[PDB]
Design a protein around this ligand. Structure first.
Ligand SMILES: Nc1nc2c(ncn2[C@@H]2O[C@H](COP(=O)(O)OP(=O)(O)OP(=O)(O)O)[C@@H](O)[C@H]2O)c(=O)[nH]1
Lengths: 85, 453
């Protein structure tokens, strides 16, 4: 739908060639599409939520879950783990 | 390393402070007085964690993991009627033994010894309802004789029944006693077991409680319920490190690691700024304080909940948990200023520790003047001063033996000689504890491991 809309727009702007209308249509297209991608990523993919999860998991941002995993797997970690199924 | 903790209500004060603490927790976690979470169970994302203290049978109901123990069924029935469905009726212990036959520690110890099977069965059943357990939080109410005896009995049972669990305790001491001899004897007998078995003990002297309740509240008359509200808010603030886990302290064992330097020194001194969840909390936005001012107030004697007796006091483990929108630069400035204004033992280079907590998303947000509060806990020897006068009482009454016809019944020893010997042993134990605390105030304490290897 975005392609059809902006294609009709550029078709209406074909007689001018290189004009400032072309540039402003480009700017509106870029702004709209960037806001749309940000919305889609934050809603359907939870971008900021993914960043928070990575910060809590890999960067150990959540001490509670880290302590939980430690008390869960301390027995296996203390034992030699040369063979891990 | 995080586990579930069960609350233990012993005595009338114990039950009252337990009721107040559970009401405060229901206020923080939006659970209310009905036991059903005031929030809809459709929102699964919760920054807090009620599991360490609330068992979840139905999705909207969170049963507080606590047992109600007392000899007076009136207060238990009152708390159950006010909190309809909130508490579990099967976890309410009264033993149907009637009213306490006096304020003797021996009476409570006997009523706990005889009905030990039922309370142990209830504790085991509650342990069966959980999987990851860490320890209990016992409320002594040592001002009462039956309450102190019951607390000592539970301590003497749980020390050997569960040695792998950390047992913290909360002893509330009165300011003035109508008959100082009986209350002093009960507190000494309970402190004997505290030194023997208890892993952590927080003292609560009622003098500072009355002073603060007269200062911050508008009413000059002080009611016991809103005074227990202070202790309940204190317990909620300290448990916030688990209910609302931070990124540094996430387990009660980890919290006590920086607070317990040795099993001997297990008595702490509390302090807290002007509260915000209490009854008369409207006169808090006129203070216009910062985090540095909050730390100063935490170090101020006017905000300590026990008898300060600050005569160059020696600190051993100074720690604090700050709840609210806290700034790191103010924290660094406050630490710089306090390290220049706090007496430390020269044998240890360990300074005070600062922790920052998070505010609940459902608690009423306060204005920018008292939006951030903090709690402080300092290991100080001056706590023995609270016992010193008490021992003084002992030291000036034990030469005759008054009120001996009341501690002879109930306990295993009906003779005067055996009770006298037990009291002398308890006095010797508390004397040795005071000697350990006064030796820890010296550098030769640590030099003892240097002189011999
Ligand atoms: N500050 C405060 N102290 C209390 C409160 N309730 C009890 N106490 C303390 O408890 C002492 C009285 O003993 P109780 O708590 O009633 O214990 P008890 O005499 O064995 O009675 P029961 O606990 O009902 O069996 C008083 O000296 C108070 O210091 C309270 O609500 N607030």
């Amino acid at each position: 739908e975005f392609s059809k809309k902006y294609h009709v727009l550029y078709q209406s702007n074909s007689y001018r060639g290189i004009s400032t209308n072309f540039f402003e249509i480009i700017n509106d297209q870029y702004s709209e599409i960037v806001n749309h991608t940000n919305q889609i990523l934050n809603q359907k993919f939870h971008y900021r939520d993914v960043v928070f999860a990575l910060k809590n998991i890999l960067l150990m941002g959540k001490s509670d879950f880290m302590d939980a995993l430690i008390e869960k797997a301390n027995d296996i970690l203390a034992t030699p783990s040369d063979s891990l199924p | 390393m995080g586990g579930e903790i069960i609350t233990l209500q012993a005595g009338q004060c114990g039950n009252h402070v337990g009721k107040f603490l559970w009401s405060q927790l229901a206020k923080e976690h939006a659970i209310g007085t009905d036991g059903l979470s005031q929030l809809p169970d459709s929102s699964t994302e919760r920054d807090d964690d009620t599991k360490p203290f609330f068992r979840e049978n139905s999705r909207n109901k969170f049963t507080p993991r606590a047992i109600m123990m007392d000899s007076e069924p009136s207060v238990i029935a009152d708390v159950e009627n006010t909190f309809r469905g909130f508490f579990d009726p099967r976890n309410t212990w009264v033993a149907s033994d009637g009213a306490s036959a006096g304020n003797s520690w021996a009476n409570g110890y006997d009523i706990g010894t005889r009905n030990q099977d039922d309370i142990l069965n209830k504790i085991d059943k509650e342990i069966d309802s959980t999987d990851n357990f860490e320890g209990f939080q016992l409320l002594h109410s040592v001002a009462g004789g039956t309450g102190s005896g019951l607390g000592s009995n539970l301590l003497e049972a749980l020390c050997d029944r569960y040695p792998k669990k950390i047992l913290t305790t909360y002893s509330v001491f009165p300011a003035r006693s109508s008959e100082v001899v009986v209350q002093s004897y009960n507190t000494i007998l309970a402190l004997r077991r505290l030194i023997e078995d208890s892993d952590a003990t927080v003292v609560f002297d009622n003098a500072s409680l009355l002073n603060i309740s007269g200062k911050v509240f508008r009413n000059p008359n002080i009611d016991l319920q809103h005074t227990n509200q202070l202790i309940s808010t204190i317990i909620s603030s300290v448990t916030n490190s688990i209910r609302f886990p931070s990124y540094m302290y996430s387990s009660m064992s980890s919290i006590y690691s920086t607070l317990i330097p040795s099993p001997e020194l297990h008595f702490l001194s509390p302090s807290f700024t002007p509260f915000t969840s209490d009854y008369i909390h409207d006169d808090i936005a006129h203070k216009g304080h910062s985090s540095y001012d909050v730390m100063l107030d935490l170090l101020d004697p006017s905000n300590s909940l026990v008898s300060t007796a600050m005569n160059n006091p020696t600190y051993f483990n100074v720690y604090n948990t700050i709840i609210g929108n806290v700034e790191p630069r103010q924290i660094s400035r406050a630490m710089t200023k306090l390290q220049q204004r706090i007496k430390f033992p020269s044998w240890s280079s360990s300074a005070m520790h600062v922790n920052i907590g998070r505010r609940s998303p459902y608690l009423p947000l306060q204005p920018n003047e008292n939006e951030v509060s903090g709690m402080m806990l300092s290991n100080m020897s001056t706590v023995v001063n609270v016992f010193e006068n008490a021992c003084n009482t002992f030291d000036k009454v034990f030469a005759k033996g008054a009120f001996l016809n009341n501690y002879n019944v109930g306990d295993l020893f009906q003779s005067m000689q055996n009770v006298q010997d037990e009291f002398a042993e308890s006095r010797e134990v508390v004397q040795s504890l005071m000697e350990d605390y006064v030796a820890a105030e010296q550098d030769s304490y640590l030099d003892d491991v240097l002189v011999d290897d």
